[PDB]
Structure formats: structure tokens, C-alpha cells
Design a protein around this ligand. Structure first.
Ligand code: HEC
Ligand code: HEC
Ligand SMILES: [Ca+2]
Ligand SMILES: [Ca+2]
Ligand SMILES: [Ca+2]
Ligand SMILES: [Cu+2]
Lengths: 106, 106
């Protein structure tokens, strides 16, 4: 599961959550996203391939995933309570977490 | 203040953070946005003036500001720490969040 596969998994499950019909289906997609993010966090992006692994830039990159994961966890709390709509809206605001790391690192 | 003035505070102080040279300027600008975000959170926006205060439509409106304040706080830490270029880049990233709430209720 290389980084590009993890990104597709994130991308694919956003679509799943948008057309989901109950909070349990959003929960399932959010959990798959959450593991794809933690798996993605392990990797090194191409835009930093020759920088040092312990660099400030690799830690900034790794922290972008903690910011995304914490949004996923906030959405998971709504899904687990059955608030399908509110959790669907939550998953929509993940888009900015995707973008904030994308600018400087994609 | 009313919602529009708070928004003016948010919009002008973003540009100020963009043009500031030192950390005391970013911090001062970030602090005004924080109070304006928390004050705007209490308002009802026109495009929702006929719904009811505990709808998932206006749950979403208030939660947008908790998330905005959280990122202003990330930027304030960096400023307080003296990383002007990093606080300036934290603050530029708020606009994705601005535009997301805007797409819905502006
Ligand atoms: C950093 C902390 C990131 C976060 C959060 C998200 N993404 Fe990402 N994404 C990132 C990088 C460095 C890259 C490039 C990797 C490469 O090998 O080029 C990507 C790429 C994508 C892609 C395209 C993948 C490809 O085929 O090259 C997609 C579709 C994508 N990212 C989607 C996506 C979504 C939906 C996110 C939030 C839910 C998201 N990413 C977060 C880095 C980071
Ligand atoms: C919801 C959670 C919002 C967030 C986050 C931000 N804004 Fe906003 N904004 C919101 C509404 C409902 C409105 C319309 C209010 C109205 O009475 O029309 C706005 C409007 C603005 C405007 C226009 C102000 C005007 O001239 O009438 C500006 C310039 C603006 N907002 C800026 C702005 C910025 C820079 C933000 C984040 C950094 C931001 N807003 C966040 C709702 C929400
Ligand atoms: Ca690539
Ligand atoms: Ca459907
Ligand atoms: Ca106006
Ligand atoms: Cu965020």
C-alpha cells in the first residue's frame, strides 16, 4: 500500500460518504480513510525524497496527517451517534485538510 | 459586533498578516480575528434567518467557527514562538475554511 494507493483510498471514500444512506456506512468509510491516512503518514512524499528523514519538512508533513486524522475522529464521533447528515457535512470539511497539505507537499 | 463587521475584521486582518514583517504584527492581527470569529459564532446569518437555532444547518454554522478558531490558535502558537513565515502560512491556509463556510451560507 504505497502512498498513491492511500490517496486513492481517501479520495474513493469521500465519494462513498457523500452518497451514504446511514451513519454506519459513513463510519465504515471514515475508518478506512483513517487507516489510509495513518498508512500514508509512514511514507515519504516525492517532493521531499532527497531531504533528510528527520527534517523539519518531514515532521510538518507527518503532522498534516494528524490534523486530517483528528478531523476524521471528530466525524467518527458524529457517525457513531447516528447523526448521518452532520457526519456527512463533517466529511465535506476534510477537503480543506487534504488541500492544506497538498499545496506545499503534493 | 454584527456578523458583517466581524467578517470585515477577518478579511482585513488576513491581508495584514500577509503583509506583516514581524511576529508582534501577526499576533496582533491573529488576536483580532480570534475575537471576531468567536463573536460571529453567536450570530444568525441572513441565509438562515428563517430556520431554527438547533438545526443541522446552524449546527454546521457554529461548528465552522470552532474549527476556524482552532486554526487561528495554531497560527497564534507559531507567532508566539516567533516563526513569522510559518504563522503567515498557517493564516493563509484559513481561506480554504473561509470559502467552505461561504459556499454554504454566504
Ligand atoms: C499530507 C499530510 C496529505 C494529506 C492530509 C492528504 N494528502 Fe493527498 N497527497 C499527498 C501527497 C504528498 C500526494 C502526492 C503523492 C505522490 O506520489 O505524488 C498526494 C496525492 C493525492 C492524490 C493523487 C495520488 C496520485 O495518483 O498521485 C489524491 C487523489 C489525493 N492526494 C487525495 C487526498 C484526499 C481526498 C485527502 C483528504 C481526505 C488527502 N489527499 C490528504 C499528501 C497529502
Ligand atoms: C462560517 C462558519 C464562516 C466562516 C468560517 C467565515 N465566514 Fe465569512 N461569512 C459568513 C457569512 C454567513 C457571511 C455572509 C454574512 C452577510 O450578512 O452577508 C460571510 C461574509 C463574509 C464577507 C462579506 C462581508 C460583506 O461585505 O458583507 C467577507 C469579506 C468574509 N466573510 C470574509 C471571511 C474570511 C476572510 C473568513 C476566514 C478567514 C471568513 N469570512 C470565515 C460565514 C463565515
Ligand atoms: Ca505522483
Ligand atoms: Ca445514496
Ligand atoms: Ca455586505
Ligand atoms: Cu482543520
Amino acid at each position: 500500500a504505497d502512498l498513491e494507493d492511500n490517496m486513492e483510498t481517501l479520495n474513493d471514500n469521500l465519494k462513498v460518504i457523500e452518497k451514504a444512506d446511514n451513519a454506519a456506512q459513513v463510519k465504515d468509510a471514515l475508518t478506512k480513510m483513517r487507516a489510509a491516512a495513518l498508512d500514508a503518514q509512514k511514507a515519504t512524499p516525492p517532493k521531499l525524497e532527497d531531504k533528510s528523514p528527520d527534517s523539519p519538512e518531514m515532521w510538518h508533513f507527518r503532522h498534516g496527517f494528524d490534523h486530517l486524522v483528528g478531523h476524521i475522529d471528530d466525524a467518527l464521533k458524529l457517525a457513531n451517534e447516528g447523526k448521518v447528515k452532520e457526519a456527512q457535512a463533517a466529511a465535506e470539511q476534510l477537503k480543506c485538510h487534504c488541500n492544506h497539505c497538498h499545496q506545499h507537499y503534493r
